[PDB]
Structure formats: structure tokens, C-alpha cells
């Protein structure tokens, strides 16, 4: 959808990266607790 309208070849490479694996863009997060700077 973004490539339908930028350059086209970089979008084709990104599409190939999609076809390879989604982790090439962003890995699923390692969830961890929020840390407060200092207690009351």
C-alpha cells in the first residue's frame, strides 16, 4: 500500500524481506516491568 504511490525498488526489497521473515523488521518485545525512578 505504501509502495503503490517514494522509490519502488527499495519497496520491492522490503517486500522480499517481508516474505523472508517478519523478524527482519522488528522482533517481538521482551516484556519487563516499568521502573520508577524513586519511591515515595
Amino acid at each position: 500500500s505504501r509502495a503503490q504511490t517514494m522509490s519502488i525498488v527499495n519497496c520491492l526489497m522490503q517486500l522480499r524481506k517481508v516474505c523472508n521473515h517478519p523478524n527482519l523488521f522488528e522482533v517481538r518485545p521482551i516484556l519487563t516491568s516499568f521502573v520508577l525512578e524513586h519511591c515515595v
Binding site: 518485545p29 521482551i30 519487563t32 516499568f34 521502573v35 520508577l36
Partner: protein, 426 residues
């Protein structure tokens, strides 16, 4: 594939841009005025300006109050915090009813914050204690190596994780959490049989930094500042196994937490998302809960509490001579705006039954559906709604897909209504 519940067909209020409600949209049929009022309330919540506003969804049984509340939640979206509740849930045994009500108040107020996470990961190449002493660890990765100095708590975490040279770890600097993810691939063939589960050597640099946005509630901050909550150290274990039960959080902690949140918002690192607290069957509350709810609504940081009741001219629980419009004492009623919910005629009952059948993947013949609608009119709408599944089961047992009149009659003869059972008792 999918499961069906009481309000699975309710996808929203079905209100257009101008605010007028279509007759049948979002799974709703009729109830136009209540849908419009709830849309106005949703707009008020989205404004994020007022605090402590309260409304009452007043109507008879099987009229569409809980459905309206769930529709408000759907319209607002998953970003905002919507806390469902029942009047019977506030009668705790660990802490008093007031504390539970306040905790639910602060659970319905949302906060979205930005935090930078410092993360280290790599294959261990050295474990040298500095001498309870600091440990000097050397982490190697595919792009570089790094040597770090860790506090004694992290040393205790590493010690209890059985981390040796050649192990791959994951130290989160902000929280001090150490996870042994496995043994390095370079040592996979060292032995032909051992319990070790091997992992590849991490890619990228050892020191990684990412910015994540996480949604928390004020109750989460209160619990964090009140009692210890996590950790891999024995000190944390003893701290949390000591004083395990809930405690009556004081106003001072809430005020300090509010100051902290104000500082966070002022710095721009956080944004506030006030939400909704839904208390269904409000008539179960005692007079003390209502009395404290009067004071709690006057707080400058409070959610838009929505209340639902199906009682009229009923006496208030706890009191012995106070007759109230809906079981709610007049002091709280003056703080509320009442949205009246109206019964359903035959045509709307028929359409509701049709849509419920469509949702549960059932096929109902027009004559059978008319009989089901007329028996729902005669006895109850919910009774007609629950008869659909037995009818479908009976039809399937006869190798027939669509529901017929005979299956409905058989289901009626098998399962009875309240009036019929009472008549049998007589």
C-alpha cells in the same frame, strides 16, 4: 472456531457522525435514546476534561444495560481503561470496602509512559568476583566484546541461574534481571548427551538500547510504591512473602503518586488516559459504600463511573426505612444523570432473535423464528435467546441443518421457564 457469549454481537453503539443512532447498527436494535446518551457520554470521556462524572443506566431486567456498557467500552477502544465490576465484588475480607472501591477507582485511570530500556546480552567469557561482592563479567557477541561490572544483586541472580563460562545471558540494566538463555552453539558438540539446550551466539552489539511505550494504571504505581513486587534475589522473596495480604493504602501514598505522575506529564514523557468504571447491579452496595462514593466522586482525579440497576422503589441495603428510586440513596442520585432504558416490542424481539441466531451460526426457518419470537414475547426475551442452542442441538441430532417448528416445540417441552416451573410447583 469461535465462541458465543451474551454480548458477542455488540460491536459498538452504531452512532453516525451527527450523533443520531440508526435503528439497527452495531448489533443494537432500538434503544435509540439510550444509545444517543451513551454516545454523548463517550464524547465526554474522550474529551478527557472532567472527573468524577457519574451516570445511571436505569431500566427493567433484560432491557440492554450491560450491553450498553460493553458498547461504550467498545466505542472508547482498548487504549482506555474500562474496569467492569459488580456490587457484590466490593465486599472483600482482606481489606475494607472503601479501600476496594478506591483501588477500582484508580484502576480505571490510565497512564501511558515512555521508557528507555538498556539491555545487555552475549556469551560469557569471564566470571571474576571483585574480591557479597561485585562480579566482573565479559560478554562477547558477533559484532564485539564488552566487559562489565555488576552489582551484588545481579551477582546473586547469576549465581542462582548456574551461569558459567560459555553461557549466554540477558541482563536488563533498568530492572537488574538476569536470564540464562542457554549454552553457546560453539560448544554444542562437546558432549553427545547432556541436558543443556543450546542457543546461537547473539547478533549485534552487546549493549542494546530501545524505547518502548507501556500502558500502566495509577493502581499499578500505588502497588509498586507500596509493596515489593518482583526480583530474583532472596531479599525480594522475603520482602514479598512478608506482609503478603492486601493493605489499606493511605491517602499520602496516593498524593505522592499523583505528584510523580504530574511530574512525568509535565516532562512530556507520559500522557493521561482517564477511563470508565462500570459497576453493575449497584443495588447490592451497602449504605457505607454509597456514602464513600459520594466523597470519592468529588476527587479531582476520578473516572467516569457508570452504574446499572434494575430495581424500583426498593429499600437500600443496610438501612431499614429508606425507600429509594433504584436502591440508590438520594444523596448519590443527585450526583448522577439517569439514562432510562425501555422495554422491547415484538418486532424488535424478533430482530434480536434473528441476529443472535445469525451470530451463533444457526439457521432458523421463518415460521419457527416467528414461534420463537411469540414465545419470547409471552415469557421472556432471554428465555427465547437461550432456547436457540438446544434447538440447534435437536436439529443436528435429526440430521437437519435449519431449525424447524417441531424442534422448537421439543426444546420447549424439555426446558421450562420460571412461570411454568412455578406453576408446576403450585
Amino acid at each position: 472456531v469461535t465462541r458465543t457469549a451474551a454480548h458477542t454481537h455488540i460491536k459498538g453503539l452504531g452512532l453516525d457522525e451527527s450523533g443520531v443512532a440508526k435503528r439497527v447498527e452495531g448489533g443494537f436494535v432500538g434503544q435509540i435514546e439510550a444509545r444517543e446518551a451513551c454516545g454523548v457520554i463517550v464524547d465526554l470521556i474522550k474529551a478527557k476534561k472532567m472527573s468524577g462524572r457519574a451516570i445511571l443506566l436505569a431500566g427493567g431486567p433484560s432491557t440492554g444495560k450491560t450491553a450498553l456498557a460493553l458498547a461504550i467500552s467498545q466505542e472508547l477502544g482498548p487504549k482506555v481503561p474500562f474496569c467492569p465490576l459488580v456490587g457484590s465484588e466490593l465486599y472483600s475480607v482482606e481489606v475494607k470496602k472503601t479501600e476496594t472501591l478506591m483501588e477500582n477507582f484508580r484502576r480505571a485511570i490510565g497512564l501511558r509512559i515512555k521508557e528507555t530500556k538498556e539491555v545487555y546480552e552475549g556469551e560469557v567469557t569471564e566470571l571474576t568476583p571483585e574480591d557479597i561482592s561485585h562480579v566482573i563479567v565479559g560478554l562477547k557477541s558477533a559484532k564485539g566484546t564488552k566487559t562489565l561490572r555488576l552489582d551484588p544483586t545481579i551477582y546473586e541472580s547469576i549465581q542462582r541461574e548456574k551461569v558459567s563460562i560459555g553461557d549466554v545471558i540477558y541482563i536488563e540494566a533498568n530492572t537488574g534481571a538476569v536470564k540464562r538463555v542457554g549454552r553457546s552453539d560453539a560448544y554444542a558438540t562437546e558432549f553427545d548427551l547432556e541436558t543443556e539446550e543450546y542457543v546461537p551466539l547473539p547478533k549485534g552489539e552487546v549493549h542494546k538500547k530501545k524505547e518502548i511505550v507501556q500502558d500502566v494504571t495509577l493502581h499499578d504505581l500505588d502497588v509498586a510504591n507500596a509493596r515489593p513486587q518482583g526480583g530474583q534475589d532472596v531479599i525480594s522473596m522475603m520482602g514479598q512473602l512478608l506482609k503478603p495480604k492486601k493493605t489499606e493504602i493511605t491517602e499520602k501514598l496516593r498524593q505522592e503518586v499523583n505528584k510523580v505522575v504530574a511530574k512525568y506529564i509535565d516532562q512530556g514523557v507520559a500522557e493521561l488516559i482517564p477511563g470508565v468504571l462500570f459497576i453493575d447491579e449497584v443495588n447490592m452496595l451497602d449504605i457505607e459504600i454509597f456514602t464513600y462514593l459520594n466523597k470519592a466522586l468529588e476527587s479531582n482525579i476520578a473516572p467516569v463511573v457508570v452504574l446499572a440497576s434494575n430495581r424500583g422503589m426498593t429499600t437500600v441495603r443496610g438501612t431499614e426505612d429508606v425507600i429509594s428510586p433504584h436502591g440508590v440513596p438520594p444523596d448519590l442520585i443527585d450526583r448522577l444523570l439517569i439514562v432510562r432504558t425501555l422495554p422491547y416490542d415484538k418486532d424488535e424481539i424478533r430482530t434480536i432473535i434473528e441476529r443472535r441466531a445469525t451470530v451463533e451460526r444457526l439457521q432458523v426457518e421463518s415460521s419457527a423464528l416467528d414461534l420463537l419470537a411469540t414465545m419470547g414475547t409471552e415469557t421472556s426475551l432471554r428465555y427465547a435467546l437461550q432456547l436457540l442452542a438446544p434447538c440447534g442441538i435437536l436439529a443436528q441430532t435429526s440430521n437437519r441443518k435449519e431449525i424447524v417448528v417441531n424442534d422448537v416445540n421439543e426444546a420447549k417441552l424439555l426446558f421450562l421457564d420460571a412461570k411454568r416451573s412455578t406453576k408446576i410447583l403450585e
